[PDB]
Design a protein around this ligand. Sequence first.
Ligand SMILES: NC(=O)c1ccc[n+]([C@@H]2O[C@H](COP(=O)([O-])OP(=O)(O)OC[C@H]3O[C@@H](n4cnc5c(N)ncnc54)[C@H](O)[C@@H]3O)[C@@H](O)[C@H]2O)c1
Ligand SMILES: NC(=O)c1ccc[n+]([C@@H]2O[C@H](COP(=O)([O-])OP(=O)(O)OC[C@H]3O[C@@H](n4cnc5c(N)ncnc54)[C@H](O)[C@@H]3O)[C@@H](O)[C@H]2O)c1
Lengths: 295, 295
Amino acid sequence: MRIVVTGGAGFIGSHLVDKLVELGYEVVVVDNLSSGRREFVNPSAELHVRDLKDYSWGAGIKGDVVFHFAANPEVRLSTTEPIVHFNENVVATFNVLEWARQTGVRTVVFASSSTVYGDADVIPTPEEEPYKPISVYGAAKAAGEVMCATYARLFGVRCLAVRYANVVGPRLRHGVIYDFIMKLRRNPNVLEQRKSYLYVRDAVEATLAAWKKFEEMDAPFLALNVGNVDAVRVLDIAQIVAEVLGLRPEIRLVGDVKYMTLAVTKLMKLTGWRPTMTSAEAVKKTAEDLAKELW
Amino acid sequence: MRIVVTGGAGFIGSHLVDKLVELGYEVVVVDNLSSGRREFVNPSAELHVRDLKDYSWGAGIKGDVVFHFAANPEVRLSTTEPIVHFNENVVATFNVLEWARQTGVRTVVFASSSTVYGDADVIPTPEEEPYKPISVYGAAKAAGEVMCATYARLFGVRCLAVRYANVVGPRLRHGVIYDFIMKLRRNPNVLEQRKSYLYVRDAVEATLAAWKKFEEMDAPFLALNVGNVDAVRVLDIAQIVAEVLGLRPEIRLVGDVKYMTLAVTKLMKLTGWRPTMTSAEAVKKTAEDLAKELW
Ligand SMILES: NC(=O)c1ccc[n+]([C@@H]2O[C@H](COP(=O)([O-])OP(=O)(O)OC[C@H]3O[C@@H](n4cnc5c(N)ncnc54)[C@H](O)[C@@H]3O)[C@@H](O)[C@H]2O)c1
Ligand SMILES: NC(=O)c1ccc[n+]([C@@H]2O[C@H](COP(=O)([O-])OP(=O)(O)OC[C@H]3O[C@@H](n4cnc5c(N)ncnc54)[C@H](O)[C@@H]3O)[C@@H](O)[C@H]2O)c1
């Protein structure tokens, strides 16, 4: 079948595309290359440079299923104008849903985020917890979810919403690991929250496993958390990154959720999926990957 | 203080403006006159014809509190293009929130809808029930709520979200009562769901009473149902309208929520408010009001 992957030129998207290609799917990538790169696009995938903010972004693009992973990266949320978060998330997602409805797309796999929970009262956070986002980005993802669920109930466009915790691995050009490497690259002698980290390989496997199970279900909409079972502190990451680079710098402490960890009991019970690496191991591996890419 | 009322030229909005003016507030009306009318605007209010779909709709407009009631009317939801519902509700609301944030507005009174509940499992429906909209309009209102709550928690722009059931009264130019009158006006001999109806007078009083109590609270966000305690069936309304017009026509049965009734226990307990008319009485009065306006 034909699979459309928005944001397929980005971090998670490019890795998702690679696995879909390995599985034999005909993959169509749609990306405006704002944060993604052509070098990350699998040679077997068909790239279409379009901007999801445009209502007619999908003109001439056909697919049976769409993995909507396009959006501005989830980082430095307080430094980006609210309108940007709104347009790149809420408007883009609505345009994807309208395209899906009008073209007869049967399934929408929406890349959501733990930010929809904001500062959750329960951690690990179960899917049952309500929307309490503290950032515009988180509100935008939550709004995207509401619209997706409605299109599923009203137009039959089924949707699996994947609420990702922190995902890390090769090709990553944003996030705490990236920032630390670039800082040490600036000054290896000096280096200026507890969250769950999942290696991109595990994240992609979990996502595809959930999608398969979802396609074997009849529920119009389903939200599922995707992340590791443990978590690591900022200072731990800083330590790991330094060791990988063989450095011993001085740590200098100079709407962002402080603590985050999603409960993945539903995912594991539904698919039998299990993480292959702990948060600390995923961070270490990623640092080694990015070292060859950035150092 | 200065009070901004978007959609103040419409049904609920014009009546809200009238009461605010009677209370002594300096009212500023912002309306694009798409469904509202200049004849409904109180002489003491300052009218500004702007389109909320424009990011800079509020340039030069200042206010301490904003009653955001602007939006396309909640009717014939399946006949209007999804993009229209999205733009007039989600985009418009976001632009109102950004304006409120950038201008220092302290309170946003958002006109929400029972449609955010969709086909609720519990009826009367308590505020605790989750978002399960079955129409694009309902998803748009729910998304508006999520954004409002986030702006309250993040930027301090406090918001009271009023989930209205069906409101009826003078100046109404849409809805079942209006449609029935126009049909009988077309042919008084022939006339081609159970919901709660509240006379606009009661709706405005409840809204203002809730706002006052909300301003005496410290909670960033609050959602409150506003509607009658009872309900009436479509055939009952048809009967009432006919009697008012002194007619005896033949009833011919030829994403819309089928059954709706909101629990108003929170509202009554918080403000001591009580409806002055039953659903059937509100419908009868409205028919008498519209008779003089349309017949
Ligand atoms: N830890 C994580 O990486 C993480 C966590 C939570 C949620 N997510 C979600 O996963 C998805 C991918 O995130 P990522 O980390 O890979 O970020 P990324 O920036 O690497 O990937 C996003 C892709 O979307 C593309 N894009 C952005 N706006 C577009 C537009 N208007 N039109 C077309 N393409 C557009 C970007 O160019 C990029 O290629 C996003 O929805 C993100 O919210 C990621
Ligand atoms: N039973 C009801 O009347 C009911 C039920 C549930 C919710 N509501 C909500 O109450 C509010 C008012 O509803 P109403 O029944 O009075 O409908 P209405 O159409 O009479 O009033 C809406 C007003 O908003 C104005 N408007 C629309 N789009 C605009 C834009 N882009 N820029 C500026 N102004 C714009 C319209 O011209 C109109 O004057 C809406 O938010 C509606 O969703 C009403």
